[PDB]
UniProtKB/Swiss-Prot annotation:
This is Short form salivary protein D7R4. GO terms for molecular function: odorant binding. It is found in: Secreted. It comes from Anopheles gambiae. Noradrenaline binds at residues 7, 22, 111, 114. Belongs to the PBP/GOBP family. Keywords: Disulfide bond, Secreted, Signal, Vasoactive, Vasodilator. The keyword Disulfide bond applies. The gene is D7r4. Disulfide bonds join 6-38, 19-144, 77-96. Modulates blood feeding of female mosquitoes on vertebrate species by binding and sequestering different mediators involved in the host response. Binds serotonin, noradrenaline, histamine and tryptamine. Inhibits histamine-, serotonin- and partially noradrenaline-induced smooth muscle contraction. Exhibits vasodilating activity. Tryptamine binds at residues 94, 111, 114. Its main location: secreted.
Length: 144
């Protein structure tokens, strides 16, 4: 199951707001809670109960932007998400990470993984100027 599959599956109050979502803008409520769980699982960033996986993010974050703060932000955000209910957990992880100083680099790792899993860029693809354009054109095909 891919991010595209999760998007295909959006109910219709959320799908008119696709581009907001795909800009990493925060949207609340339990429809969003279950989209973001779907996508975080599709990208292999959270466990089944929806808890952030430290080890899926630590190395990828640090390769792009080497920074001690990724450890700190990961521990904080996992700590938060564990304390909310499972319906809400992956979304809370996602929201926390985006708000932290790791947000910048998280969006890059997230973009890269999305397009790697979509077969659109090679598995060793780095966050290059070319890649930024590939992402923009990919979004444009989606009306974003
Ligand atoms: N290329 C980023 C697309 C994106 C950002 N946040 C999302 C949340 C749900 C699904 C896609 C996204």
């Amino acid at each position: 199951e891919t991010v595209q599959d999760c998007e295909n599956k959006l109910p219709p109050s959320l799908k008119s707001r696709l581009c907001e979502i795909r800009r990493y803008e925060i949207i609340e409520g339990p429809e969003m809670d279950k989209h973001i769980h779907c996508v975080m699982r599709a990208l292999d960033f959270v466990y089944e109960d929806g808890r952030g996986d430290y080890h899926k993010l630590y190395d990828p974050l640090n390769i792009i932007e080497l920074d001690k703060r990724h450890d700190v932000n990961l521990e904080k955000c996992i700590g938060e998400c564990v304390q909310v209910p499972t319906s809400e957990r992956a979304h809370v992880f996602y929201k926390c990470l985006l708000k932290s100083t790791t947000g910048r680099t998280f969006k890059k790792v997230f973009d890269l993984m999305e397009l790697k899993k979509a077969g659109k860029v090679p598995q060793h693809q780095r966050y290059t100027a070319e890649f930024v354009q590939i992402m923009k054109d990919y979004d444009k095909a989606l009306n974003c």
